[PDB]
Amino acid sequence: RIPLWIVATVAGMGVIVIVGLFFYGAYAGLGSSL
């Protein structure tokens, strides 16, 4: 049994990380301007 509040907070941060990775790519990848 894994406490629900832990499941959300971990999957929560996990989403912020991957989504934050996308925003970084906006300044580095092909989607840049440099």
Binding site: P3, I6, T9, M13
Partner: peptide, 28 residues
């Protein structure tokens, strides 16, 4: 170069100071 090491610790610090409270059970 990779200060992601910092955030990580200070990031898990938040849920920790209440997780330890879920272990010692009290005052939530």
């Amino acid at each position: 170069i990779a200060q992601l090491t910092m955030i990580a610790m200070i990031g898990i610090a938040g849920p920790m100071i209440i997780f330890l409270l879920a272990v010692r059970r009290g005052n939530l």
